[PDB]
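assembly run, all chains below
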Amino acid sequence: AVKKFKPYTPSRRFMTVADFSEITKTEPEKSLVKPLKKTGGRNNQGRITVRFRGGGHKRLYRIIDFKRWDKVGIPAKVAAIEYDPNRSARIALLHYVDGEKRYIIAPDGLQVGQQVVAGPDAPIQVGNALPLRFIPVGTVVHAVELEPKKGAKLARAAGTSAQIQGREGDYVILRLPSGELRKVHGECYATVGAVGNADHKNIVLGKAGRSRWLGRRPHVRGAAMNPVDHPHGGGEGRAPRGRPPASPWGWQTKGLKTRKRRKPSSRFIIARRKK
Amino acid sequence: MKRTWQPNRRKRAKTHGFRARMRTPGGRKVLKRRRQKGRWRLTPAVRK
RNA sequence: GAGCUAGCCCUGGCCAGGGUGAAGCUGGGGUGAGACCCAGUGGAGGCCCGAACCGGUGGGGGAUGCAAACCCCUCGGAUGA
RNA sequence: GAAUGCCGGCAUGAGUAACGAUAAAGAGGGUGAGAAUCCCUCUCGCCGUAAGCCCAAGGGUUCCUACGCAAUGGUCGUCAGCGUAGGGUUAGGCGGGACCUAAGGUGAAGCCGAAAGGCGUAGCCGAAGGGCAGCCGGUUAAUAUUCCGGCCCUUCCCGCAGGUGCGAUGGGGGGACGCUCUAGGCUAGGGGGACCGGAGCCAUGGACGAGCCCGGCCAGAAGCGCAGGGUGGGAGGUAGGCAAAUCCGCCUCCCAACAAGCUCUGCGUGGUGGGGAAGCCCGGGUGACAACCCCCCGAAGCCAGGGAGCCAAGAAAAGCCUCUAAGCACAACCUGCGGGAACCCGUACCGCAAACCGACACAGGUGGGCGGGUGCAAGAGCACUCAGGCGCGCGGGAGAACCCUCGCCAAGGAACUCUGCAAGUUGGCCCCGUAACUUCGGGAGAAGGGGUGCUCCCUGGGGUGAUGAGCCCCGGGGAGCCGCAGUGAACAGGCUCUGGCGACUGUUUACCAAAAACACAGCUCUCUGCGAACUCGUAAGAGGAGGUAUAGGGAGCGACGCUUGCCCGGUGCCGGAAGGUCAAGGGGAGGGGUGCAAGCCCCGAACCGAAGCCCCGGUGAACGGCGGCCGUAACUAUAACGGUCCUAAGGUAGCGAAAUUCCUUGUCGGGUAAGUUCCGACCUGCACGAAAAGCGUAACGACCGGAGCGCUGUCUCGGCGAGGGACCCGGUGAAAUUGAACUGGCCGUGAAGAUGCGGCCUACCCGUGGCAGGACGAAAAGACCCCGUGGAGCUUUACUGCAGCC
RNA sequence: CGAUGUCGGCUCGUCGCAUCCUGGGGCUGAAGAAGGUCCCAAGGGUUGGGCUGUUCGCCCAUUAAAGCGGCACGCGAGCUG
RNA sequence: UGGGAGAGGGUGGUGGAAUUCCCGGAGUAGCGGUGAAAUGCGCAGAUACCGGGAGGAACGCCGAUGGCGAAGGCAGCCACCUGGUCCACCCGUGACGCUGAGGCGCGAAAGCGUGGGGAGCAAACCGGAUUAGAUACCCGGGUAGUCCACGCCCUAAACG
RNA sequence: CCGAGGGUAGGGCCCGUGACUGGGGCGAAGUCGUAACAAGGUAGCUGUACCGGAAGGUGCGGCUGGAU
Ligand SMILES: CC[C@H]1OC(=O)[C@H](C)[C@@H](O[C@H]2C[C@@](C)(OC)[C@@H](O)[C@H](C)O2)[C@H](C)[C@@H](O[C@@H]2O[C@H](C)C[C@H](N(C)C)[C@H]2O)[C@](C)(O)C[C@@H](C)CN(C)[C@H](C)[C@@H](O)[C@]1(C)O
Ligand SMILES: [Mg+2]
Ligand SMILES: [Mg+2]
Ligand SMILES: [Mg+2]
Ligand SMILES: [Mg+2]
Ligand SMILES: [Mg+2]
Ligand SMILES: [Mg+2]
Ligand SMILES: [Mg+2]
Ligand SMILES: [Mg+2]
Ligand SMILES: [Mg+2]
Ligand SMILES: [Mg+2]
Ligand SMILES: [Mg+2]
Ligand SMILES: [Mg+2]
Ligand SMILES: [Mg+2]
Ligand SMILES: [Mg+2]
Ligand SMILES: [Mg+2]
Ligand SMILES: [Mg+2]
Ligand SMILES: [Mg+2]
Ligand SMILES: [Mg+2]
Ligand SMILES: [Mg+2]
Ligand SMILES: [Mg+2]
Ligand SMILES: [Mg+2]
Ligand SMILES: [Mg+2]
Ligand SMILES: [Mg+2]
Ligand SMILES: [Mg+2]
Ligand SMILES: [Mg+2]
Ligand SMILES: [Mg+2]
Ligand SMILES: [Mg+2]
Ligand SMILES: [Mg+2]
Ligand SMILES: [Mg+2]
Ligand SMILES: [Mg+2]
Ligand SMILES: [Mg+2]
Ligand SMILES: [Mg+2]
Ligand SMILES: [Mg+2]
Ligand SMILES: [Mg+2]
Ligand SMILES: [Mg+2]
Ligand SMILES: [Mg+2]
Ligand SMILES: [Mg+2]
Ligand SMILES: [Mg+2]
Ligand SMILES: [Mg+2]
Ligand SMILES: [Mg+2]
Ligand SMILES: [Mg+2]
Ligand SMILES: [Mg+2]
Ligand SMILES: [Mg+2]
Ligand SMILES: [Mg+2]
Ligand SMILES: [Mg+2]
Ligand SMILES: [Mg+2]
Ligand SMILES: [Mg+2]
Ligand SMILES: [Mg+2]
Ligand SMILES: [Mg+2]
Ligand SMILES: [Mg+2]
Ligand SMILES: [Mg+2]
Ligand SMILES: [Mg+2]
Ligand SMILES: [Mg+2]
Ligand SMILES: [Mg+2]
Ligand SMILES: [Mg+2]
Ligand SMILES: [Mg+2]
Ligand SMILES: [Mg+2]
Ligand SMILES: [Mg+2]
Ligand SMILES: [Mg+2]
Ligand SMILES: [Mg+2]
Ligand SMILES: [Mg+2]
Ligand SMILES: [Mg+2]
Ligand SMILES: [Mg+2]
Ligand SMILES: [Mg+2]
Ligand SMILES: [Mg+2]
Ligand SMILES: [Mg+2]
Ligand SMILES: [Mg+2]
Ligand SMILES: [Mg+2]
Ligand SMILES: [Mg+2]
Ligand SMILES: [Mg+2]
Ligand SMILES: [Mg+2]
Ligand SMILES: [Mg+2]
Ligand SMILES: [Mg+2]
Ligand SMILES: [Mg+2]
Ligand SMILES: [Mg+2]
Ligand SMILES: [Mg+2]
Ligand SMILES: [Mg+2]
Ligand SMILES: [Mg+2]
Ligand SMILES: [Mg+2]
Ligand SMILES: [Mg+2]
Ligand SMILES: [Mg+2]
Ligand SMILES: [Mg+2]
Ligand SMILES: [Mg+2]
Ligand SMILES: [Mg+2]
Ligand SMILES: [Mg+2]
Ligand SMILES: [Mg+2]
Ligand SMILES: [Mg+2]
Ligand SMILES: [Mg+2]
Ligand SMILES: [Mg+2]
Ligand SMILES: [Mg+2]
Ligand SMILES: [Mg+2]
Ligand SMILES: [Mg+2]
Ligand SMILES: [Mg+2]
Ligand SMILES: [Mg+2]
Ligand SMILES: [Mg+2]
Ligand SMILES: [Mg+2]
Ligand SMILES: [Mg+2]
Ligand SMILES: [Mg+2]
Ligand SMILES: [Mg+2]
Ligand SMILES: [Mg+2]
Ligand SMILES: [Mg+2]
Ligand SMILES: [Mg+2]
Ligand SMILES: [Mg+2]
Ligand SMILES: [Mg+2]
Ligand SMILES: [Mg+2]
Ligand SMILES: [Mg+2]
Ligand SMILES: [Mg+2]
Ligand SMILES: [Mg+2]
Ligand SMILES: [Mg+2]
Ligand SMILES: [Mg+2]
Ligand SMILES: [Mg+2]
Ligand SMILES: [Mg+2]
Ligand SMILES: [Mg+2]
Ligand SMILES: [Mg+2]
Ligand SMILES: [Mg+2]
Ligand SMILES: [Mg+2]
Ligand SMILES: [Mg+2]
Ligand SMILES: [Mg+2]
Ligand SMILES: [Mg+2]
Ligand SMILES: [Mg+2]
Ligand SMILES: [Mg+2]
Ligand SMILES: [Mg+2]
Ligand SMILES: [Mg+2]
Ligand SMILES: [Mg+2]
Ligand SMILES: [Mg+2]
Ligand SMILES: [Mg+2]
Ligand SMILES: [Mg+2]
Ligand SMILES: [Mg+2]
Ligand SMILES: [Mg+2]
Ligand SMILES: [Mg+2]
Ligand SMILES: [Mg+2]
Ligand SMILES: [Mg+2]
Ligand SMILES: [Mg+2]
Ligand SMILES: [Mg+2]
Ligand SMILES: [Mg+2]
Ligand SMILES: [Mg+2]
Ligand SMILES: [Mg+2]
Ligand SMILES: [Mg+2]
Ligand SMILES: [Mg+2]
Ligand SMILES: [Mg+2]
Ligand SMILES: [Mg+2]
Ligand SMILES: [Mg+2]
Ligand SMILES: [Mg+2]
Ligand SMILES: [Mg+2]
Ligand SMILES: [Mg+2]
Ligand SMILES: [Mg+2]
Ligand SMILES: [Mg+2]
Ligand SMILES: [Mg+2]
Ligand SMILES: [Mg+2]
Ligand SMILES: [Mg+2]
Ligand SMILES: [Mg+2]
Ligand SMILES: [Mg+2]
Ligand SMILES: [Mg+2]
Ligand SMILES: [Mg+2]
Ligand SMILES: [Mg+2]
Ligand SMILES: [Mg+2]
Ligand SMILES: [Mg+2]
Ligand SMILES: [Mg+2]
Ligand SMILES: [Mg+2]
Ligand SMILES: [Mg+2]
Ligand SMILES: [Mg+2]
Ligand SMILES: [Mg+2]
Ligand SMILES: [Mg+2]
Ligand SMILES: [Mg+2]
Ligand SMILES: [Mg+2]
Ligand SMILES: [Mg+2]
Ligand SMILES: [Mg+2]
Ligand SMILES: [Mg+2]
Ligand SMILES: [Mg+2]
Ligand SMILES: [Mg+2]
Ligand SMILES: [Mg+2]
Ligand SMILES: [Mg+2]
Ligand SMILES: [Mg+2]
Ligand SMILES: [Mg+2]
Ligand SMILES: [Mg+2]
Ligand SMILES: [Mg+2]
Ligand SMILES: [Mg+2]
Ligand SMILES: [Mg+2]
Ligand SMILES: [Mg+2]
Ligand SMILES: [Mg+2]
Ligand SMILES: [Mg+2]
Ligand SMILES: [Mg+2]
Ligand SMILES: [Mg+2]
Ligand SMILES: [Mg+2]
Ligand SMILES: [Mg+2]
Ligand SMILES: [Mg+2]
Ligand SMILES: [Mg+2]
Ligand SMILES: [Mg+2]
Ligand SMILES: [Mg+2]
Ligand SMILES: [Mg+2]
Ligand SMILES: [Mg+2]
Ligand SMILES: [Mg+2]
Ligand SMILES: [Mg+2]
Ligand SMILES: [Mg+2]
Ligand SMILES: [Mg+2]
Ligand SMILES: [Mg+2]
Ligand SMILES: [Mg+2]
Ligand SMILES: [Mg+2]
Ligand SMILES: [Mg+2]
Ligand SMILES: [Mg+2]
Ligand SMILES: [Mg+2]
Ligand SMILES: [Mg+2]
Ligand SMILES: [Mg+2]
Ligand SMILES: [Mg+2]
Ligand SMILES: [Mg+2]
Ligand SMILES: [Mg+2]
Ligand SMILES: [Mg+2]
Ligand SMILES: [Mg+2]
Ligand SMILES: [Mg+2]
Ligand SMILES: [Mg+2]
Ligand SMILES: [Mg+2]
Ligand SMILES: [Mg+2]
Ligand SMILES: [Mg+2]
Ligand SMILES: [Mg+2]
Ligand SMILES: [Mg+2]
Ligand SMILES: [Mg+2]
Ligand SMILES: [Mg+2]
Ligand SMILES: [Mg+2]
Ligand SMILES: [Mg+2]
Ligand SMILES: [Mg+2]
Ligand SMILES: [Mg+2]
Ligand SMILES: [Mg+2]
Ligand SMILES: [Mg+2]
Ligand SMILES: [Mg+2]
Ligand SMILES: [Mg+2]
Ligand SMILES: [Mg+2]
Ligand SMILES: [Mg+2]
Ligand SMILES: [Mg+2]
Ligand SMILES: [Mg+2]
Ligand SMILES: [Mg+2]
Ligand SMILES: [Mg+2]
Ligand SMILES: [Mg+2]
Ligand SMILES: [Mg+2]
Ligand SMILES: [Mg+2]
Ligand SMILES: [Mg+2]
Ligand SMILES: [Mg+2]
Ligand SMILES: [Mg+2]
Ligand SMILES: [Mg+2]
Ligand SMILES: [Mg+2]
Ligand SMILES: [Mg+2]
Ligand SMILES: [Mg+2]
Ligand SMILES: [Mg+2]
Ligand SMILES: [Mg+2]
Ligand SMILES: [Mg+2]
Ligand SMILES: [Mg+2]
Ligand SMILES: [Mg+2]
Ligand SMILES: [Mg+2]
Ligand SMILES: [Mg+2]
Ligand SMILES: [Mg+2]
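ok done. output:
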């Protein structure tokens, strides 16, 4: 559920907030946060390399466990579900019977109080992580690794998930969130379930100030610039594009495919994304 | 109205100072040239 | 050469007083249970009026200037991008 | 002798403009060669959320005293931020360093680059952030938390006593955090006192008084008191916190738990040390053996790391505490006490300014703290005023035109004008009241009106007391009084109706444009499977992102409502293992040079041979495009209908003389006495039209139109008055410009607009205040325009390259 | 072209006369009154509004009349813009 | 109290046939479609056949002139939660009843909003035919929609 | 004091009227086609939705008031 506002200001008419209902703890585990060094979009030369970034709210980075095969067999209790400003998913604090504490991204349906575990022998229940070859075909999973022991790479955003669709040799066939059909090694880990906070995509930002809180500086159209700035610059009064629509750098931006053609991973991608 | 010279000793020393010149091919050529011209000061004096 | 200016990064600081009165909560009403309604409480907001502060709308002055952009009157924002 | 030449000197304009805020001066006394200008006294005015006080930048002796006045000072000068000289800045506790990390910078290891160099985990550096021990008073011409005085405190070293498994750059805890709102209790600061202390005063009609005037505190170890912050205790298990661990984490059990306990801070008190007014008298003396008390108001400050709520989810590292490892356990550490030790740099003065940034003693710019009182609803607003500081470094007259800033105006009331430009009007608070429309918030301070002072009387609730008096905050009712007028001064919306554009708050051409432009939430297309795409870089490395398709990049459109048609022939993009074309390379029929020869060397056909292009499809919120002619209906007119040429296809819905309409002031209607504008219609749309979006839309706008009401010197149409200039006298004294000048009018002439030529007319010599018609007046080697085989920015299916990609 | 500032308005005029009015005339298809047309005449006079940047023009209400031209399409070291 | 029948409703699961698409094989000169045709698809290897996979929707036979519901309407199968109704006993209450303006709830399909999903079908649309013409009927394509969740809409030859 | 009413301001209801515009009825002597009544030459009707010179068409679902 997403929360609306009465229109007692022009911007509150449309503004919506997350309901934050799943959140049981309002402070991060101190041993698990580090400062997040804001960049402004500038690289190590001082140069803007990603436009329109900067000036968002201060954040601490919560250390997330994207491995979990780190601790095979050691169960843990779901102690809390917390807010994480560095991602759309919520995070879940785990208390291992080890006494070690860790964050994972909170799956849909996770319950504070329940227990989860990782390993080849783990039950097929929401919150547990297994190598891909031990999860039944048809199971929806998230936090999927792409290569063994390299870290969960796929299906990490709010409400996303991948589905297992078959097996073939050492690999298992996944349907990624994008709809792509891809081979992933069977030894890659995944966590059964879908990522939570699925209402994330129904948030209406509401005003320009809200993008600013998120670190998004105003984006300015090429058409509003001059020929020294952008292919769409200049013209007297308003102008149509007057050429194939292009980026600030001249490459075409309405259909031009851009994945590198001789890329080794193409052997493992069965079907390009649909839609 | 606010003008262009707003003196600041740390800024002066860190920007035009002797050590800043020495760290850099172009800066050592400034010192070499000013020495060759016989300048009395090779670098702005800043109080510290 | 970024001690002016533009953007960003780190760390500090500032914004008189007044006005409006969102959610929620409590009580009452209502119903099979509800929705909802009323009152109180509450104190939200690129909300309102207005100083500091930030501006520079219209007019007047100035025009070998007090000033290589100033002055008076008026005017915009003033918890926020 | 000329180059708007160059350097210098000196003229002209000219005793002219000006002398830098209109906060303001007058007199007496003194000094001196000289005094509007220096010192002193009295009077007057100005600032007082500052124009007063303190701190940080920056400045660098400008500070204090003596002696000076050539120059500097917009005049003067005896004076000075000026000249000469002498003096002046005192710290274990204030700030910085011998502590910590932030961005960033640097950088063992490592990586990269023709060279120079670029990067880079650790580490190091880096502060106005973290951490750390001093308060009050006195003293100097000039320093003071630094000297002195009183009362306090920190670290290091050594020793003594007691206690303990001591020991770290390693483990852990803590340090450690947002925004808005906010409780309790305090303090700062303030108001009052018929009480306490005090030199005195009785004026001019009254008052010897519960009179007037003045003051009535500051710091303070331990202890104690009030108020707060922080913190659960024990045992057992233990596989996690890259070794170890008794610590921390996890599990269980017992007790304690909104109590307490322990601990820490604030405030009060506190041995003790200080301070101490008006007035009088020559900074000091006196007041004075000063008194030093009660009531009230009360922070944004303190307790603090308090509490709640919210989403955008809010540094690090050390000090500190705890754990153990080597080790070492006669040590080491902890606690108490004692003695000793305790370095370097800054410290003057200015500091919203005459000492900083602006060439100037420049109406400009400059971060933090304190910033009293009364009244006005509040307040840091406004008026006055305290402490404190000033009167702005040319003056004296005069009383013209004109200019500036200001005040008022008969009758009219927008008739002004591009426009009510400007200026009036309105104006705070309380009460009554308030429309279309609406996204149900709003529109709204709609509009419109009523009240507002003072006196007496009665009374209501809150705060503090105590539950009462007193004080204080918010009120209420009745009866009266005065004036032209009661937010009596200062600060404080004119309003309404209706269109265009943009939804909205925001942003912008620093210094001619603030807008309808940019942005914006939101909508759609598209790219991207993660060593992502994309961006910067030769690279390494970075950003993206410590993110992962509910994500990230690119593009257009721009809240929201209802919508977004047809054309894929061309261009783009996407798909297509066929076919055609296709480079290097492969192949080697055949041919050539040379040699006596084996041989060496060269040319070279078929055939094989990628991307790209051709070709086949798809694709519009991709670039874009979206017809013409003839005929036809009981009068006319028109044409639902038919025919025909062309096209890739012929503009759908909606809107339309429009931010678009040439003809054009189209025509009709509305408003007006009169309407090229405005509003409403019509549709022959020169030349609207659907995300360079179409048509609407409440609310919003220093946007741009049109109308009305109110009110006015905008105007009829001008008048008077004020001050600052202008004018006269004393002081100081520029500027552009200038071929030289002994520089009149007409009609002619002249390179075609003559003071300068001809004819004629007119005219004694020289100034001062004024006005601008001429000197084709000044300024700027015309921006327009052209020319130059001049330049530069920008575009593209111009040429030719390059990067990048294939 | 080493610069001769431009429309329109305002202000301030002055001139020409091919005269709009007022004065004097002849002819008339001049009864009168009112006109028409031409001649003489430049002394003075020649309104206020709505629209539009406008000049011009149209219109409202008046008038004896609501003249037309020149003066760098008079006049920006006079103003406006 | 004791029994019954039933596509009554709601939720979670789950099975098979078929269609379409994708991959592998095998194969070649057409397939498709109609009254007859053409557009279309097919030597860039279609149709027909075999194997594998994905995905959505609807449930063949049973099935009836049947059953249930107040109406709309409900059909594979399993479970859970839940409504109405019939019978037998004649045991309990003692007229507690009938109707019902307003009210409230439910209400096929289409349609709307926000998400998802999308095989087949198919308004709009494009093309081929038919025809005097053919903005149709028929044929080849084709987007909303049809499906799920939640919220609206409240209509009907909502009929016996 | 109250007070006829006058004045200022803002609302509500009704009537008349208005450039232009929407459809309706009647007229009939026209133009276009032929949607319905027969299986009306695509059974009809229907709610809704989208479309078309027009009657209408199509989709989805419903009714028989459908011939054979
Ligand atoms: C406001 C102060 C300024 O003074 C002005 O603005 C004047 C009103 C300006 O005038 C303004 C306003 C305006 C309307 O003047 C007519 C405009 O056209 C010009 C460009 O500038 C002048 C008349 C222009 O001089 C005009 O240059 C035109 C191109 C041609 C014209 N011709 C008539 C010869 C000539 O007078 C000029 C070129 O600006 C002057 C030039 C010599 C020097 N300027 C550079 C100076 C520094 C000015 O900035 C200034 C003194 O500070
Ligand atoms: Mg909302
Ligand atoms: Mg709300
Ligand atoms: Mg709500
Ligand atoms: Mg709004
Ligand atoms: Mg919420
Ligand atoms: Mg949540
Ligand atoms: Mg939730
Ligand atoms: Mg926090
Ligand atoms: Mg990080
Ligand atoms: Mg980072
Ligand atoms: Mg760096
Ligand atoms: Mg760098
Ligand atoms: Mg970018
Ligand atoms: Mg950026
Ligand atoms: Mg989160
Ligand atoms: Mg969310
Ligand atoms: Mg959104
Ligand atoms: Mg953010
Ligand atoms: Mg964006
Ligand atoms: Mg933009
Ligand atoms: Mg532009
Ligand atoms: Mg550039
Ligand atoms: Mg370019
Ligand atoms: Mg370009
Ligand atoms: Mg362009
Ligand atoms: Mg253009
Ligand atoms: Mg343009
Ligand atoms: Mg433009
Ligand atoms: Mg254009
Ligand atoms: Mg443009
Ligand atoms: Mg634009
Ligand atoms: Mg263009
Ligand atoms: Mg375009
Ligand atoms: Mg083009
Ligand atoms: Mg891979
Ligand atoms: Mg500065
Ligand atoms: Mg300096
Ligand atoms: Mg400095
Ligand atoms: Mg500094
Ligand atoms: Mg600096
Ligand atoms: Mg230096
Ligand atoms: Mg020098
Ligand atoms: Mg020397
Ligand atoms: Mg130097
Ligand atoms: Mg540099
Ligand atoms: Mg700077
Ligand atoms: Mg900070
Ligand atoms: Mg503020
Ligand atoms: Mg309230
Ligand atoms: Mg609450
Ligand atoms: Mg605001
Ligand atoms: Mg406001
Ligand atoms: Mg201004
Ligand atoms: Mg004004
Ligand atoms: Mg004025
Ligand atoms: Mg100027
Ligand atoms: Mg000013
Ligand atoms: Mg001013
Ligand atoms: Mg104002
Ligand atoms: Mg305001
Ligand atoms: Mg405010
Ligand atoms: Mg704001
Ligand atoms: Mg010569
Ligand atoms: Mg010269
Ligand atoms: Mg000269
Ligand atoms: Mg010269
Ligand atoms: Mg010279
Ligand atoms: Mg001379
Ligand atoms: Mg002169
Ligand atoms: Mg002069
Ligand atoms: Mg001057
Ligand atoms: Mg003044
Ligand atoms: Mg003197
Ligand atoms: Mg003198
Ligand atoms: Mg004096
Ligand atoms: Mg200096
Ligand atoms: Mg001193
Ligand atoms: Mg002197
Ligand atoms: Mg002198
Ligand atoms: Mg001097
Ligand atoms: Mg001076
Ligand atoms: Mg002397
Ligand atoms: Mg001086
Ligand atoms: Mg001395
Ligand atoms: Mg000391
Ligand atoms: Mg030392
Ligand atoms: Mg520090
Ligand atoms: Mg102290
Ligand atoms: Mg001293
Ligand atoms: Mg932290
Ligand atoms: Mg901090
Ligand atoms: Mg804030
Ligand atoms: Mg007080
Ligand atoms: Mg207390
Ligand atoms: Mg253990
Ligand atoms: Mg004393
Ligand atoms: Mg004494
Ligand atoms: Mg405050
Ligand atoms: Mg959020
Ligand atoms: Mg760090
Ligand atoms: Mg040992
Ligand atoms: Mg101990
Ligand atoms: Mg030392
Ligand atoms: Mg020193
Ligand atoms: Mg000092
Ligand atoms: Mg100032
Ligand atoms: Mg100086
Ligand atoms: Mg200057
Ligand atoms: Mg300068
Ligand atoms: Mg001065
Ligand atoms: Mg100054
Ligand atoms: Mg004070
Ligand atoms: Mg007031
Ligand atoms: Mg007030
Ligand atoms: Mg004010
Ligand atoms: Mg006072
Ligand atoms: Mg003065
Ligand atoms: Mg005079
Ligand atoms: Mg008057
Ligand atoms: Mg009027
Ligand atoms: Mg009037
Ligand atoms: Mg106007
Ligand atoms: Mg007022
Ligand atoms: Mg109204
Ligand atoms: Mg409303
Ligand atoms: Mg609102
Ligand atoms: Mg009012
Ligand atoms: Mg209004
Ligand atoms: Mg009185
Ligand atoms: Mg008065
Ligand atoms: Mg005043
Ligand atoms: Mg106001
Ligand atoms: Mg209105
Ligand atoms: Mg218009
Ligand atoms: Mg609009
Ligand atoms: Mg706007
Ligand atoms: Mg705009
Ligand atoms: Mg809008
Ligand atoms: Mg918008
Ligand atoms: Mg906006
Ligand atoms: Mg604002
Ligand atoms: Mg500008
Ligand atoms: Mg400019
Ligand atoms: Mg400029
Ligand atoms: Mg400039
Ligand atoms: Mg500029
Ligand atoms: Mg301006
Ligand atoms: Mg501007
Ligand atoms: Mg503005
Ligand atoms: Mg915009
Ligand atoms: Mg939109
Ligand atoms: Mg690059
Ligand atoms: Mg890297
Ligand atoms: Mg990265
Ligand atoms: Mg990163
Ligand atoms: Mg990402
Ligand atoms: Mg925009
Ligand atoms: Mg609407
Ligand atoms: Mg069309
Ligand atoms: Mg096309
Ligand atoms: Mg194409
Ligand atoms: Mg093209
Ligand atoms: Mg031979
Ligand atoms: Mg579309
Ligand atoms: Mg084309
Ligand atoms: Mg286009
Ligand atoms: Mg006819
Ligand atoms: Mg057209
Ligand atoms: Mg039209
Ligand atoms: Mg229009
Ligand atoms: Mg047009
Ligand atoms: Mg034209
Ligand atoms: Mg026109
Ligand atoms: Mg026109
Ligand atoms: Mg007209
Ligand atoms: Mg107009
Ligand atoms: Mg106009
Ligand atoms: Mg027409
Ligand atoms: Mg565009
Ligand atoms: Mg446009
Ligand atoms: Mg609007
Ligand atoms: Mg505006
Ligand atoms: Mg006047
Ligand atoms: Mg007067
Ligand atoms: Mg006067
Ligand atoms: Mg005067
Ligand atoms: Mg005067
Ligand atoms: Mg005289
Ligand atoms: Mg001469
Ligand atoms: Mg001439
Ligand atoms: Mg001449
Ligand atoms: Mg002549
Ligand atoms: Mg002459
Ligand atoms: Mg001569
Ligand atoms: Mg001669
Ligand atoms: Mg002569
Ligand atoms: Mg003469
Ligand atoms: Mg003379
Ligand atoms: Mg003249
Ligand atoms: Mg002149
Ligand atoms: Mg002359
Ligand atoms: Mg002249
Ligand atoms: Mg001239
Ligand atoms: Mg030149
Ligand atoms: Mg030239
Ligand atoms: Mg030129
Ligand atoms: Mg020039
Ligand atoms: Mg030319
Ligand atoms: Mg040429
Ligand atoms: Mg030539
Ligand atoms: Mg040339
Ligand atoms: Mg060029
Ligand atoms: Mg590329
Ligand atoms: Mg010229
Ligand atoms: Mg010249
Ligand atoms: Mg010139
Ligand atoms: Mg007659
Ligand atoms: Mg005659
Ligand atoms: Mg005359
Ligand atoms: Mg005359
Ligand atoms: Mg005209
Ligand atoms: Mg006309
Ligand atoms: Mg008459
Ligand atoms: Mg007459
Ligand atoms: Mg003329
Ligand atoms: Mg002419
Ligand atoms: Mg002309
Ligand atoms: Mg002129
Ligand atoms: Mg001018
Ligand atoms: Mg003019
Ligand atoms: Mg002239
Ligand atoms: Mg004008
Ligand atoms: Mg073949
Ligand atoms: Mg059957
Ligand atoms: Mg019985
Ligand atoms: Mg329904
Ligand atoms: Mg539907
Ligand atoms: Mg036809
Ligand atoms: Mg549709
Ligand atoms: Mg749709
Ligand atoms: Mg039936
Ligand atoms: Mg009356
Ligand atoms: Mg028929
Ligand atoms: Mg039929
Ligand atoms: Mg139609
Ligand atoms: Mg038609
Ligand atoms: Mg159809
Ligand atoms: Mg039915
Ligand atoms: Mg029948």
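Helices of chain B lie at 9-16, 18-22, 25-37.

Chains B and A do not touch (no CB pair under 8 Å).

not gonna interpret more than that til we talk
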